[PDB]
Each structure stands twice: as C-alpha cells, then as structure tokens.
Amino acid sequence: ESKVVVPAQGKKITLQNGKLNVPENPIIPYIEGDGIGVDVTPAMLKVVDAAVEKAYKGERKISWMEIYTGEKSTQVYGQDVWLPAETLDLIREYRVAIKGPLTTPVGGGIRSLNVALRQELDLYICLRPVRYYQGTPSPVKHPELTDMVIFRENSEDIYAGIEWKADSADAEKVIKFLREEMGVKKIRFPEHCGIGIKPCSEEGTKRLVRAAIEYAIANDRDSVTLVHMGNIMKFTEGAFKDWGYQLAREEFGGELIDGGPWLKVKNPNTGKEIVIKDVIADAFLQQILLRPAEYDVIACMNLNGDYISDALAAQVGGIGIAPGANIGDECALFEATHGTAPKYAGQDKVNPGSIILSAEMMLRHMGWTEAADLIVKGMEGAINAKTVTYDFERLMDGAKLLKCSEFGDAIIENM
Amino acid sequence: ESKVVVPAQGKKITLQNGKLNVPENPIIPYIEGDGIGVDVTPAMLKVVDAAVEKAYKGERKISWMEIYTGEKSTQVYGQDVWLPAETLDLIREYRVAIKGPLTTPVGGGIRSLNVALRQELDLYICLRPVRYYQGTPSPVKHPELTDMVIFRENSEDIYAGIEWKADSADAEKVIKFLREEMGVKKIRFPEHCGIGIKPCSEEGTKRLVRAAIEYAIANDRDSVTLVHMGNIMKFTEGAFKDWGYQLAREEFGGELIDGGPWLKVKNPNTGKEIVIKDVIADAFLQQILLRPAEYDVIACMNLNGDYISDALAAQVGGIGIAPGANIGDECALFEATHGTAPKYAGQDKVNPGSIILSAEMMLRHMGWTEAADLIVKGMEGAINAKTVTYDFERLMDGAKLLKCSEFGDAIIENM
Numbered sequence A, B: 001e002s003k004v005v006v007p008a009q010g011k012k013i014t015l016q017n018g019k020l021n022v023p024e025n026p027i028i029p030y031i032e033g034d035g036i037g038v039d040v041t042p043a044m045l046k047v048v049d050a051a052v053e054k055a056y057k058g059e060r061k062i063s064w065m066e067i068y069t070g071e072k073s074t075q076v077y078g079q080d081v082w083l084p085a086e087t088l089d090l091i092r093e094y095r096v097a098i099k100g101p102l103t104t105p106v107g108g109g110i111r112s113l114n115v116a117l118r119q120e121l122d123l124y125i126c127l128r129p130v131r132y133y134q135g136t137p138s139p140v141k142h143p144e145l146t147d148m149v150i151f152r153e154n155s156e157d158i159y160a161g162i163e164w165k166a167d168s169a170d171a172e173k174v175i176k177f178l179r180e181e182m183g184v185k186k187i188r189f190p191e192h193c194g195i196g197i198k199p200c201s202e203e204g205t206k207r208l209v210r211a212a213i214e215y216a217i218a219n220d221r222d223s224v225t226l227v228h229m230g231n232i233m234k235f236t237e238g239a240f241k242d243w244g245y246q247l248a249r250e251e252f253g254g255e256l257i258d259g260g261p262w263l264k265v266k267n268p269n270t271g272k273e274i275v276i277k278d279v280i281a282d283a284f285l286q287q288i289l290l291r292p293a294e295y296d297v298i299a300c301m302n303l304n305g306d307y308i309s310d311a312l313a314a315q316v317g318g319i320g321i322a323p324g325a326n327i328g329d330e331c332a333l334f335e336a337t338h339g340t341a342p343k344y345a346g347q348d349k350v351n352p353g354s355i356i357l358s359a360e361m362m363l364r365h366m367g368w369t370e371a372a373d374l375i376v377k378g379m380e381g382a383i384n385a386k387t388v389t390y391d392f393e394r395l396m397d398g399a400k401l402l403k404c405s406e407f408g409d410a411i412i413e414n415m
C-alpha cells in the first residue's frame, strides 16, 4: 500500500491548452534525494515557503507532498524499490515536482535513475540556465560575461542506454549483422568489442529546438546557437543542426543573414532580430571561455548538453549552485544538479544553492514569478554579502562561513 | 605519374625492434596544409632547420619532401584527388611526417581527411600535450597550473564514421533489426531517425592505455587518469575504464590504493608511485578548471579526447599554439591542430606556434631532443618577450605585433 500522504489542504495543478492552471494552494511532490539531499531539501522547503509567503502576503501556500526515488525509496518500500511506479504516476498527475540529488546503485544492472525519470516521463527538455552571481569565487577572469540558457535534448543520443557488452552473444550478433548485412568495415577490432547506438530523430530534434526558440522569444534573448559535431557525425549531430535550422525557417520565419548559414528570427513581441547560428561542439567548449558574451540560448543533443552545462557551471563558480529542470508536455521535474556527496550527508554543511535555484525555476514555471524573483534576489544578496557555505568560503578571504541551513536563512534575509 | 620528388641528399628513417633508426640526414615528408598552411609551414621549416643546425652544429640536416593531401592535392593531381594513395604510402614508408591544417570539402560525401589519415595509417594515439607558456594571454586566473598530456584513442568511438541517414533504406534496415531482432525499445522516435554506431574494443583500449602508462613512466609523470562516461555508457566508455585499470594491473604491477578504485604503478626507473585513477568526463571538464594541478597524463576515448584537448588548449591561451601528434606502431604524423582560417591565408599573419610545437614533438620523437629543447626554449622566450602575432597581441597591452614569419624569427632568436 502507498506510504505517500496526499495533503488534506491543497489542490492539484491542472493542464489546459498547454497552460498550467495553478491554484493558490498547489500540492507539490518532492523527492528528498540521496546523501546531502537530507541537508539541502529542508533548506529549500524553508526558502521557498518564505518566498511564497512574502510574495503573496499569505494568500498562496504550497502543500508539499513527499514522494520517493533512490536510496530512501528502498528504505520506505523495500529492497528492490529504487523507482516506484507511483512516483512516475504522481509526478505526471501533479504536473510539477522537485528533487534532491539521486544516486544509482552499481552491481545490480540498474541504469541512471535520473535518466529513468526523464525518459519514462518523456521530459525531453533539460533546461540549464547558467549565469554569474557577483561575489562568487570563479576560476576565470570574467565570469560575468556568461549568461546562457542550455536546452539539452533529453530523450535520445547515446545517453538513451542502448548498448551491448563486449563478448556477449548480443554484441556478437549486432556486430555480425553490421559487418555482413550492412557491410560495415570501420570497426577496427570486431572481437571483444562493446557496441552502443546513437539515435537522433527529426521529431526529437524539432521539439527540443522549438522549445529553445520559443524560450528566446518569451524571454527576449539575443540568439539561439545549435551546438553539434556534424562535421564528424553527419547523420545524427549534423542532422540535428540541419533540422534545427529548418525548424527556424519553417515555423519562425527565419531569414538568411548575409550568405548563410546564420538566420534571423523576428521576435513577434519585441521586434528584436534573434540570431540563429551554429558552432561545432569542440570549438564551442573553447568559445564559452574565449567569447562567452557572444552566446545566449543553446540548443544541443543529450551528451553535448551534459558537457556544456557542466563546463559552464564550473567557469562561473556555480558547480554547486547550478539550477536545472526536466520539462515535458505533461509535467516537469526540477532538480539539484550536483552529486550526492555522501561524505558530508547530515552535516548541514553543503551548498543548498542548486536545489534552491531549481525551486526558483519551478516557481517561475508555475507562473509565480514574484516568489521566483524573491529567491533570485535573496541568492544575489547572500552571495554578494559574502555570507556563504564552505565551498565558496574556502576560495575566498573575508567571508563569513555559514552552515547549509544558515545560508538558507541568509537567502531569506536578503529577499 | 607521381609529382613527389624524393630528395637526392637524404636517407629514409627505418624501424627496428620498435625503435626508429634515424640518420643525420632524414627525409621528412610534409603536407603544406590548406588555408593558413601556406603561412605557417614556411615558418615551421625555417624554425626547425635553425634548431637542427644550432643543436648539431651542421652535422645533421632534414631533407624535406613535400607530399599532398587536401585542396593542394586536387590542384597537383586533379579534380577528385583529395588524399592520394601515395601519401598514405609515403608516410608509412618514411616513418615520420608533419602537416599543416587540413579541411574537408562538403557536398561530395567525403569524410574528414584528418580522420582518414589517422584511421588508414592506424595512428591509434592522438597525443596532445597542453602546458602554459608564461606571458600567454589566458581567460583563466591560473593557467600555469595546467600541465597535462592527452592520450586520445584515435581508431574507434562514434568518431569512426559508422552511421546512416534518417529515412534512408539502410537506416530503416538497421532500426528494424534493432527493434525486432535485438528487442530494442529505447529508440524514442524510430521514424526519420538517424543512427550512429559507437564501438570500443579491449585491444583498442589497451594499446592506447599501454602507450599512456609507458609515457608516464618514460617521462616520470605523476598519474594517469582514465576519463570516461561509464556511468551512462557502461559497455563502451565503462569498458574502456575497466580495461584501462585491468591493463595497469596485468602489465604494470598496479597495486590498490586504500579501498579502491585507484591504483599505484611503480615507475621502474625512478621508483615514483604513479597514480592510476578515473574521473567521469563531464565532471572532468569542471575539474580541469577547478583543480588542474591534480591531473597529468590523461587516457580517454576519441570524442572525449577531442573535447578535453580543445577545452584545455583554450584555458591556457593555447587555442592557436596547441601541438599534436598521431602515432602508430609503424609511423607517425605530427600536425597543426587549429583550423585553416582561409580568410587570413597568405597574409603572413596567423600564429605558427601550433605547427612549430608539433615539429618540436616530431624532433623529440626522432630522438633529436636537443633540437626539440631549442624550439621549446625559443617559444618560451618569444612569448615571454611579448613579441607575438595578432592573436596574442590583441589580448595584451605593451606587446610588439609580429607577422607570422617574424614570430618564427623571434623563436629562432630566443633559442
């Protein structure tokens, strides 16, 4: 029997015509998260409640409902229950949810729980905005020049988990087929060879890129850059870029800039000419360091998005405070983007900034922009005040060391 | 008939027992390179000749022999001759060669010429050392903490070019096979879907990792880090890491550090305990910025190596002066690692640092360490003297702007 308790006071968010109908008392499912989730989640709940209370003068209030996934799920439902069917059902049913870091066990043949949540709920958009918060200790000279929003495709690519182990009967079978029936000759060593499949479809590419362009329009952003490795992988990465440009032309009236290949899409609200361009992935990893100001909205495939998001987070000193969201047509799951750091679990020491900023994204997604704005304001003030957790403090001089919970309070105090 | 002229004075380098027998007058094949290759190659030839002349007091002298690949090949041999069979033969025959940047044409269905050279000559090691040269304008605060050597697997991975176009009969065939015979269910959108294959074998992984560990030993390096995405791709990237550790144990007496998974390999010459460790690729892209001093020799797959090498080059301000080598058991091809920048071709303006430093690697590979040391010394002095090309100069104050050829002279002057 389920151990999830539906809040007595609270109402389910609904979806109508692609628009969320959020009540003043929405029930929001939340997954504590493994390791440090025990530290960061309480801080997030308190910070969000304060922002909501302050923004709407007590008129609105979230009814938090704990659901399970990960190590805590096994402890609540038993041995092999890492991801309960009800969790997938509840997230879909309640439309909006948030979670702390999750870890996948090894030895049992189970694949990434984070990816499982994304694929099973068809949350095809991994949204990762990366900006700099003044006062944050950064390894680069000008982190303030970084203000990007990453639209990472979440349902395809090698990240889809389609592969076979070297020497397995399946691997031999696939390799045999490829060589004998497909005439593949580029497999350097066919024996003791692992094989993975990388899929990329037109519908997959277009729904991701459509969301990216719509975001640029809605937020009056300057450009959308299709990042890919099409020079090497023409049929997957290359097709992604091709379909991205095609979508811009076919659905957003994209016009040619100069002799190509860049396009300009007129923002139907501001009249701003949004530039649609593309950069080879490896070169892009250099350009984010060398010319960050030239980039804004980024649209890319699963793996590249994972790399780009992490690299960007690192350079702005946001490795531990990078917000993230997994959005689909029916529901959305916001999440802390860092690991579980089990060594510090329960020490009330880690930075709750990531999950808090992800809650900021959640609030904005629900249409509660005032509360979201309050969290952004609190984070900016706390960081600028140099009242921070150990991860920031250790890289700074003249900073006040704060516990995880205390930093949560600092954010509230700066709202 | 061939238009390659074998130098009258000069002798072929030979290979015996895995050791190169280099004469005092070795014939070295060289490919000018497209675009700026017309600028950087002459500078390289002059710099190398000066280093050789100075190091060995006129006793040794390279007999340069021009061979063709790329745009210049089509002009020398005709319309469709992008990569002549003789070029592959000559490089193998002469054992050591160098080349300027190469570009692959689009529209003719031809794949990367750089990859073609690597795969066809089985140059399985892409060696990319990345260090900082004092005085180089860098986007990071402490580029001097970067001193790494990248061992990128060069014959496998998605980089192998095994793929089929969306809607092609072949793609449909493969997808059908995967779904109906392999029972694959993770292909989100089977229609209008491009497909790529990612292979990774035990022999491929081990020969790359073997070279990496041997390099750490020969150069008394502190550690070898296996970089991979095994948490997501268990059978390719994960297997790579597994085989890498296994090789360390089976062939280099690797011992367990603490409770694992790190290993220590005793350097048989210095007694130094070389640490063998591993880091997930996305996290590694963050760690190179946050904790560069903790890394040294890196062993990774093709694609990850491409990303890591470019990211590292960018952070030390070496985007245009990053050396590179493609090494196999029978021959080796050193190369400028940047693009062709056709806009500046012939303007004697671009930085010849990349191809020159690659020539430094070449000289060292031939056992001519004195000459190689002279080039390193010249580069360090020229850069530190602030007498540099536009790409450096534009990011600095109080620097003397030099043409490509002039920077070549500056290097010589600082030898």
Ligand SMILES: O=C(O)CCC(=O)C(=O)O
Pocket: A104, A112, A113, A114, A115, A306, B232
């Ligand atoms: O894949 C996982 O298990 C963790 C989530 C992750 O690192 C990501 O894809 O960014």
Ligand SMILES: O=C(O)CCC(=O)C(=O)O
Pocket: A232, B104, B112, B113, B114, B115, B306
């Ligand atoms: O692949 C090419 O054509 C250029 C060489 C390259 O960028 C590389 O693999 O680093």
Ligand SMILES: [Mn+2]
Pocket: A306, A310, B282
């Ligand atoms: Mn990640």
Ligand SMILES: [Mn+2]
Pocket: A282, B306, B310
């Ligand atoms: Mn490259």
